[PDB]
Amino acid sequence: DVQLVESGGGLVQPGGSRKLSCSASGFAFSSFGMHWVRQAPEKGLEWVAYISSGSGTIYYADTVKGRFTISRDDPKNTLFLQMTSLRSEDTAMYYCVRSIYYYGSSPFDFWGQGTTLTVSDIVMTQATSSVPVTPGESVSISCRSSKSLLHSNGNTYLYWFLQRPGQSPQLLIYRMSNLASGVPDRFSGSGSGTAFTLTISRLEAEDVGVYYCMQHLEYPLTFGAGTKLEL
Amino acid sequence: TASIAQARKLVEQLKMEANIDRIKVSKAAADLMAYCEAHAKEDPLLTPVPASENPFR
Amino acid sequence: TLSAEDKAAVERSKMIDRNLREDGEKAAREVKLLLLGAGESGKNTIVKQMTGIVETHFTFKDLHFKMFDVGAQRSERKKWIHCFEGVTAIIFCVALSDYDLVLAEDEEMNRMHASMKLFDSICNNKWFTDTSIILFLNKKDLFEEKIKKSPLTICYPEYAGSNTYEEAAAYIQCQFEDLNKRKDTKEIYTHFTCSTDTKNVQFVFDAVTDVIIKNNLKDCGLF
Amino acid sequence: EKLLSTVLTTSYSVIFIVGLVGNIIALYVFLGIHRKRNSIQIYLLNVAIADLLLIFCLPFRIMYHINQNKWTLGVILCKVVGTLFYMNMYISIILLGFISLDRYIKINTTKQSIYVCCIVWMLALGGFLTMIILTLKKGGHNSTMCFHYRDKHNAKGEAIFNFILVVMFWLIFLLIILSYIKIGKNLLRISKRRSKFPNSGKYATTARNSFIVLIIFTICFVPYHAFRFIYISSQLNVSSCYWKEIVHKTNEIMLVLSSFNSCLDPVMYFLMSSNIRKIMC
Amino acid sequence: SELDQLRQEAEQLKNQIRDARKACADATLSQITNNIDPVGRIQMRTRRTLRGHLAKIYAMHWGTDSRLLVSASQDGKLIIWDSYTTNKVHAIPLRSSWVMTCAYAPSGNYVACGGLDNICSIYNLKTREGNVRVSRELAGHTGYLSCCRFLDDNQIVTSSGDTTCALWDIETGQQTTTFTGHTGDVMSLSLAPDTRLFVSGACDASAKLWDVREGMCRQTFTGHESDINAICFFPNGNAFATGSDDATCRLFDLRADQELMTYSHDNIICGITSVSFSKSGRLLLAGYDDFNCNVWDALKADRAGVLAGHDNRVSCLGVTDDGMAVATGSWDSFLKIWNGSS
Ligand SMILES: CC(C)CCC[C@@H](C)[C@H]1CC[C@H]2[C@@H]3CC=C4C[C@@H](O)CC[C@]4(C)[C@H]3CC[C@]12C
């Protein structure tokens, strides 16, 4: 089965260095681009770095550029993140994310379990922080972007993720309308221009969690604040 | 006895093909002409679309 | 002017072209041989020495060979013979001991003459104008034994030569090479093989190398 | 210049007629008859183009000798046509240097061939601009004549650049001799080892064609560049008027021989390649 | 005695069928469509050139989205193309390089191919591992695989060189129905728009109409003088066109049970490899051995235009479901996308 196991996290002193590893099994690692995404405690998701398939393209976030180095070992199916000059702002759970890019693909479909590190631009807005919900009732979640995510090729590069309590984020909607594999049809993504809505018909207990909207129109990838659903 | 067995099958097959209902060629020709006329406007190869509507600019 | 995922899709295509280029380079260094002949003519014995199409891979002196056997297909030959246009050479197997035999299916056609019509069509085929032929004459030891009992006059009525093995073997070789109606574009390499022979692979390597070198001399424009 | 002008007018007329007809037919084969090309045929396409441009420069030189060495088209056009002739003569030499290197490797890549030709054309074009700029900047050129002997006392930079080309030629001609000799001897021994085979005379014939390419390149180009060192040194040093006109006559006659390769480049490829002979016949 | 008597009855039945067809041949399609205006000159330009195949291309098939297509070449590579951008979406290495046909599933989740190996291999395009893998190898044919067409994700029809066509259950890997009756190698097949019938052309110069569910031959169409290499249903399913080695294309009608029109020219002396219709069916595009693709007027049998952009045989062609463009594959290892301009 598809697996992504992170290791190397732990308590480090400020200004130190730490090496994060992501071992991949059950899929063609060399065919997938890889991202590092971190989540500060009691905070939302934050994109860190990206390395393409074949290691030809590498991108970094501005807050980490120059201090973090991302690399991969295709024969060993291992993804690396070399970190230096670690600050207290870097204390977060770091997730290993696979993403393949071709016509009709679903990037960000699988997330790793994450590793915890403790140290001693289009704006995506989710104004509604929390929504009280009851099972069997329809819920809508709204997302906004400072720039239009609709490209001239007809795609709207908006993604929806669900992070259940204690679990890694899961892809629900990719490119603002398509439903991710393994996701019930009750989830539906609708949007236009800068305003997007995620409709959840017949809400269930499993749907409880935090929902993040991410833009993939251009780098750096930015996440919304997140909308929490509670019973 | 392979040839005699094949002969029985071939004769039986020709009976099925000979019992079908056939319409006139003029009736069949009119339907082909009618179908082309009805869908002529929505045929990009017959009537090329403006460059704005052409995905292969 | 591309999106973020569009620029990543193009990079994926560029990697595909890189792998396609590498596979083309690897495939262009391999010798492809089309193995032909009649049934029970020693062809099976050749494969050992070296329901659709049977492919055999072997390496000899830093050279990789691909041998394609299409004797198991009873369909129309002209509907798939163009698929082998471009092989390095054609390995044609002829059984010398079958000169006095009669074709089992037809019951009135000489077995040796059945090989000539197969050889004539392949050699003069429009898809193999520039393809050399490696003619293997198998069963030479059994051919000598049948010579003493059954003379070559049965196979060739207009054969005034002696009944010795050397004269009989050379006459058959000349008849096959005379079926080549294009003696300039292509060349025919004739070898006398046997069940116990071990130099058959060497002759293929020598003949293939001769074909490969003469292909370069045409590319360079010096020939 | 009574005898020399008569010889050049007839000599260049023969080259122009054979060169224009010969190269156009060659330019047809590489474009029309052939759809896919290998590295060798890529170079020979550009050699045909370079030799064709050299042929189009001949009518300007022919018309000059017809009017008894009276030039009227202007100083700007005389320098453009005069430098364009030498530009294409050294594109052929450089490319034929690459053909010998390409043939040597194959006997003893299409994308890499196209880059080589584009680099050569751009580098050769830059040299064409360099000569034009260095020659027109001085601005001491009479409009009454062209293609004449010039003692370049005040144009030492122009003469030194020419000297580099002559040294550049002897590096390429060394490569051509070192390759076609190795090709010819490689195919001669192979014919000895493979004597017993259905066709062993192909290697002997192919090795013969290797020496014919070397001989045509040697006969056409070596006499000109061997004497060019004398021609350059006479321009710089002070020499007698009698000696100066001997060097001019020798250079112009050898320049006819050097131009004759523009006709023997297509003809040599037609006869050596059996494919083109069969296609024509 | 019995054999001689039976073969005389077959001739009587053939005469009965021939008389029945002649009885309903009151008029000709040419006479009916004489009054209508011609389509004029059809000019198509090469919008895209798909490069990357290193050998002869033998088959191509559009996906139902009119954007993705799969092509097969005998370099042992199945390639899926994004026709809008010319990007390569996948490159599937084939176990057997002697591929002769390829098909794109209407759902887009599977592709199929097969050749001289007598096997139809099904490839899964949507896997969690991110690569294309073989999902099924359909064995059972005793000759080379010449054509294959999906009915859905679980059913596929294949024609082989063993003179038979088969309907396969992909999940079980077994051929549920076998279609016998051709006396030569079946070279092509075309599915009806409702996927309840399909026509196949063989080397016996005859085209047979088969019932998928019932499993028998309903009608037999003759008239060609050489092997049929290509066949394509009319968009309404009531007619089909064939292409043979005799340099002719013929339009047969299912309900009239006879040929309606012949598409041939005196200059054309080469065999035909592929045929297809435009979305409205007014244009018949045929690929030829003379390196060209001729666009015919289906109703008036006039050569509307020529697609001359290949240096070897045009081995395959296909028109998108929306009718926007036509792709041509060729032995020169290139694919080209064509459409006109206002
Ligand atoms: C001042 C002028 C006359 C100098 C000559 C300019 C022209 C004739 C030269 C300069 C650049 C040359 C081109 C450079 C590169 C190529 C690609 C090659 O695969 C075909 C020949 C071709 C296309 C050349 C054709 C001739 C060319 C266009």
mmCIF file of C-alpha atoms and ligand atoms in Angstrom, chain D residues 45-46 49 53 84 87 114 118 121 125 128, ligand 1:
data_model
loop_
_atom_site.group_PDB
_atom_site.id
_atom_site.type_symbol
_atom_site.label_atom_id
_atom_site.label_comp_id
_atom_site.label_asym_id
_atom_site.label_seq_id
_atom_site.Cartn_x
_atom_site.Cartn_y
_atom_site.Cartn_z
ATOM 1 C CA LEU D 45 23.675 20.188 -47.493
ATOM 2 C CA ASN D 46 25.462 23.210 -46.014
ATOM 3 C CA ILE D 49 24.624 25.986 -49.887
ATOM 4 C CA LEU D 53 26.683 31.279 -52.603
ATOM 5 C CA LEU D 84 31.575 36.995 -49.406
ATOM 6 C CA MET D 87 33.620 33.639 -46.546
ATOM 7 C CA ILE D 114 22.967 20.785 -36.695
ATOM 8 C CA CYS D 118 24.853 26.747 -36.981
ATOM 9 C CA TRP D 121 27.710 29.793 -40.010
ATOM 10 C CA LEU D 125 29.215 35.473 -40.570
ATOM 11 C CA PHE D 128 32.484 38.485 -42.699
HETATM 12 C C1 LIG F 1 24.955 38.193 -45.875
HETATM 13 C C2 LIG F 1 24.287 36.860 -46.214
HETATM 14 C C3 LIG F 1 24.347 36.630 -47.726
HETATM 15 C C4 LIG F 1 25.014 35.725 -45.494
HETATM 16 C C5 LIG F 1 24.306 34.400 -45.777
HETATM 17 C C6 LIG F 1 22.966 34.360 -45.038
HETATM 18 C C7 LIG F 1 22.258 33.023 -45.283
HETATM 19 C C8 LIG F 1 22.391 32.657 -46.765
HETATM 20 C C9 LIG F 1 22.871 31.933 -44.393
HETATM 21 C C10 LIG F 1 23.185 32.499 -42.982
HETATM 22 C C11 LIG F 1 22.598 31.493 -41.956
HETATM 23 C C12 LIG F 1 22.481 30.214 -42.791
HETATM 24 C C13 LIG F 1 21.578 29.132 -42.222
HETATM 25 C C14 LIG F 1 22.203 28.630 -40.915
HETATM 26 C C15 LIG F 1 21.588 27.329 -40.485
HETATM 27 C C16 LIG F 1 20.931 26.537 -41.279
HETATM 28 C C17 LIG F 1 20.368 25.254 -40.691
HETATM 29 C C18 LIG F 1 20.757 24.093 -41.604
HETATM 30 O O1 LIG F 1 20.185 22.878 -41.112
HETATM 31 C C19 LIG F 1 20.221 24.379 -43.005
HETATM 32 C C20 LIG F 1 20.957 25.588 -43.585
HETATM 33 C C21 LIG F 1 20.696 26.832 -42.729
HETATM 34 C C22 LIG F 1 19.228 27.228 -42.892
HETATM 35 C C23 LIG F 1 21.539 27.988 -43.240
HETATM 36 C C24 LIG F 1 21.025 28.464 -44.596
HETATM 37 C C25 LIG F 1 21.869 29.624 -45.143
HETATM 38 C C26 LIG F 1 21.912 30.770 -44.129
HETATM 39 C C27 LIG F 1 20.501 31.308 -43.867
#
